[PDB]
Amino acid sequence: MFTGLNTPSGVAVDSAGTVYVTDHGNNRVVKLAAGSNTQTVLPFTGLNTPSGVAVDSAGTVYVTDHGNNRVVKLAAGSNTQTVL
Amino acid sequence: MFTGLNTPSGVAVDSAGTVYVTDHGNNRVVKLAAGSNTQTVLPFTGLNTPSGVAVDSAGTVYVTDHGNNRVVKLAAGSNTQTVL
Amino acid sequence: MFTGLNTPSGVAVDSAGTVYVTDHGNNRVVKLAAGSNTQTVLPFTGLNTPSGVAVDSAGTVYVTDHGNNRVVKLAAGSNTQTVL
Ligand SMILES: [Cl-]
Ligand SMILES: [Cl-]
Ligand SMILES: [Cl-]
Ligand SMILES: [Cl-]
Ligand SMILES: [Cl-]
Numbered sequence: 001m002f003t004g005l006n007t008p009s010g011v012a013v014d015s016a017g018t019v020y021v022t023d024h025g026n027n028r029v030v031k032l033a034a035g036s037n038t039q040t041v042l043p044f045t046g047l048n049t050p051s052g053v054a055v056d057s058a059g060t061v062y063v064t065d066h067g068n069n070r071v072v073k074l075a076a077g078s079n080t081q082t083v084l
Numbered sequence: 085m086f087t088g089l090n091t092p093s094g095v096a097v098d099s100a101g102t103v104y105v106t107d108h109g110n111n112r113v114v115k116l117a118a119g120s121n122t123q124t125v126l127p128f129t130g131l132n133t134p135s136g137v138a139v140d141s142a143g144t145v146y147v148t149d150h151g152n153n154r155v156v157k158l159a160a161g162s163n164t165q166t167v168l
Numbered sequence: 169m170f171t172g173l174n175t176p177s178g179v180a181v182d183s184a185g186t187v188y189v190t191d192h193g194n195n196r197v198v199k200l201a202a203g204s205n206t207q208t209v210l211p212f213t214g215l216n217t218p219s220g221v222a223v224d225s226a227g228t229v230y231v232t233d234h235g236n237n238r239v240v241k242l243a244a245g246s247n248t249q250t251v252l
């Protein structure tokens with residue numbers, strides 16, 4: 001289950017069936033792996049009411065950091081976002 | 085044509101070219117099949133100002149049900165959503 | 169870099185790694201080609217606080233033109249949008 005969401009805004013799904021959600025009112029991005037019962041919080045930092053999310057074929061995750069007027073990305077496995 | 089939309093928020097497109105739209109102010113999700121002149125309303129139920137939509141490779145449709153703080157999905161052909 | 173964004177809302181990424189963003193408060197859609205240092209503004213016209221974006225396998229770009237209650241698209245290479 002996704003839990004503790006606040007007014008979620010965006011959603012994306014990768015080729016593995018992992019679903020990524022911008023949890024807009026909690027200033028975070030969460031994901032739920034296919035056949036997992038437990039969400040994870042992606043290691044973005046400093047998000048402000050994030051609104052949309054996409055995931056490319058390499059599993060890189062892209063987020064419109066709505067409140068900070070910027071776009072950020074995280075490579076799969078990475079813990080350090082890049083600002084586009 | 086898409087018609088009767090109210091402040092649509094999200095859009096997705098599948099490998100068949102079917103376009104899915106969250107019709108935010110009408111509390112519904114609509115789709116337009118590639119080379120169709122007529123939209124369909126997907127059989128989600130109880131949506132509250134839905135904001136984003138995605139579609140996986142099996143045609144499963146995922147929606148951030150923004151006002152209800154939850155994520156919902158419908159398998160292709162299914163009439164019964166699942167809350168994630 | 170993406171620059172001059174205002175409260176960006178949606179994001180999509182194509183199979184080439186080109187990232188497309190709805191630059192919501194500037195009434196436009198921007199894109200950044202993979203390994204490019206410079207954004208481009210897509211030739212949509214008349215957008216009103218656009219909210220979501222998607223890109224199909226042929227590079228056609230779809231935008232929910234939120235304020236105008238409509239969905240618009242541009243074929244790759246085209247300078248003339250179509251209203252869906
Ligand atoms: Cl909100
Ligand atoms: Cl907001
Ligand atoms: Cl609105
Ligand atoms: Cl709302
Ligand atoms: Cl806004």
Ligand SMILES: [Cl-]
Pocket residue numbers: 217234
């Ligand atoms: Cl708005």
